[model samples]
Target: DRPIEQQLALGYIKALTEHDYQTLSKYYNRDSVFYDKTADTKYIGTRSIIAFLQRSHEGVLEFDFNIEHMFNTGPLVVMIGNYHLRGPGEQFGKPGKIIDIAIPGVTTLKFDPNTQRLTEQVDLMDYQTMSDQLQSQ
Candidate 1:
C-alpha cells in the first residue's frame, strides 16, 4: 500500500496533467507555497499557485508525469519523475512552431500533519535539456 503522502503527490501530478485545478487545490493548504527552480519563481497560497499553473500551461496541449521513485521522511516527501510537455515551441522561446519535450525532475512536498495538506512544494528540473528539446525540429 502506498503512503498517504505518496498518494497525495500522485493525485497532484494527475490533476496537473488533466488540467484539474479544482482538484489540485484540494491537496494544498490555503497558505501553501510553491517554488519552481527552473522558472525561478515562487507562488504563495493556493490561489496564487493555481493562477501560476493556469498561465504556465496556457498553450500546453498535452502533458504527462511519470514517477520514477518516491521517498518520505516525517511530514515531507520527495518524488523523482519524468515530466513531458507538448505544445507550441514559441511558448518555450524555441523557433520551431510545435514541440514535445521531456525532462527529468524532482519535487519536494511538505505536508501539514494536522490537516494533511501540502504546506510547501519545490520543483527542480533540467532546464538545459528542456530548452534543447524545445529548440529541436
Candidate 2:
C-alpha cells in the first residue's frame, strides 16, 4: 500500500481502467479541472469532466489504464501512464486492441492539503500526435 495520495492516484487509474466514471468523480474537487491531449478545451470543473466521461464511455469498450510511475510531493502528485481502448477483443483477437495508447504521459494532479481531494489535473502529453490522429479520423 502507498500513502493516501498515492493510493488516490491508483484509485484514479483503476477508475479509468474500468471506466467507472461515478467512482472517479469521488476523488475530484468540486471545481477540479482536467486537460488532456484529445481535449479541444479544458474540462473546467468536475461536473463537466463527469459528463465528458459519460459521453466517451458510451462509445468505448474494454478500456484500460496502466500507471507506470508516480512522483509525489505533499499536496501534488505526478503520474506517468498509458491508456488503451478498442473494439471487442473476444472475437477480434486482443480484446480491445489498444487503439489509443501513449508512452509515459505526464499527468500533474493537485490535491487539497487539508482534504486530500484532487483539485486539478493536467495531462501534459504530446498533443500534436494525438491531435493529428484525431483529426485524421
Candidate 3:
C-alpha cells in the first residue's frame, strides 16, 4: 500500500502531466523550486511555476508522465519517472510536433505537514541527453 505522502506526490505529478496549472499550484509551497534538466533552469515559487506551465501549454500538443518508482520517507517523497512531450522546438529550424523523451529522473519534494503542501523540490536529471534526443529528431 502506498503512503499518504506518496499518494499526494503522485497526484502532484498527475496534475503536471495533465497541464493542470491551477491544481498544481494548490500543492506547491510558496517558495517551491522546480528544476528542469533540458533547460538547465529552475522555476521557483508558485507564481513562476504556474506561469511556466501556462506558457508551456501553448505549444504542447500532448504531455504525459510515467512513474517508475516512488519512495516516501516522512514528509518527503522522491519519484522517478519519464515524461513525454510533443511540441514545436524552442529554437528555429526545428521540426514541428517533435517528441522529446528522457529516462526517469528523480524529483525530491518536501512537504509541510501543517498545510500538506510542498516546501522544496530539487530535480536531479540529465538535460543534455534530453536535448540530444530532441535535436536528433
Candidate 4:
C-alpha cells in the first residue's frame, strides 16, 4: 500500500494529465507553489497553477504522462516520467498543425504534513531535447 503522500502525488499527476482542474485543486492548498524549470516560470496558489497549465496545454489534443520511476521520502515524492504531447498545436516554433513531442521530466512534490495537501511542486524537463526534436522535424 502506498503512503498517503505518495497516493496524493499520483492523484495530482493524474489530474494534471487529464486536465481535471477541479480534482487537482483538491490536492493542493490555496498557497501551493508550482515551479516549472523548463519554462522558468513560477506559479503561486492553486488557481494560478491551474491557469498556467491550461494555457500551456491550449490546443493540445492529447497529453500523456508515463511514469518511469518514483521515490518517496517522508513528505516528499519524486517522480520521473516522459511527457508526451500529441496532436495539433502551435508550439516550439511549429505552425498550427499536427505535432508530437516527447520529453523526459522529473517532478518533485512536497506535501504539508498537517494537511496532507501539496505545498510545493517543482518540474524539471528536458527542453533542449524537445526543442531539438521540434527543429529536426
For this target, which candidate reaches the highest TM-score against the unseen true structure? 4
User: What overall lDDT goes with each candidate model?
Assistant: 0.83, 0.68, 0.76, 0.85
lDDT per residue (tens digit) for residues 1-137 in model 3: 79988888888888888888878989876678777654578888899888877886777777776678889889889878876666676542465546656644677778887898878777777666676786677
User: What is the alpha-carbon RMSD of candidate 4 to the true structure?
Assistant: 1.4
Query: Could you give candidate 1's per-residue lDDT for residues 52-135 as a string of tens digits?
Result: 899888878889877888988877889898888888766677655767888899989898878878888899988888877765
Candidates by TM-score, descending order: 4, 1, 3, 2
Q: Model 1 segments beyond 4 Å from truth?
A: none
- Those runs of model 4 whose alpha carbons end farther than 4 Å from true positions after fitting are none
Q: What is the TM-score of each candidate against the true structure?
A: 0.89, 0.72, 0.83, 0.91
Model number with the top lDDT: 4
Model 4 residue 38 lDDT score = 76
Better of 1 and 4 by lDDT: 4
Error of 4 at 102 (Å): 1.1
Residue 40 Cα positional deviation in candidate 2, in Å, after optimal superposition: 6.1
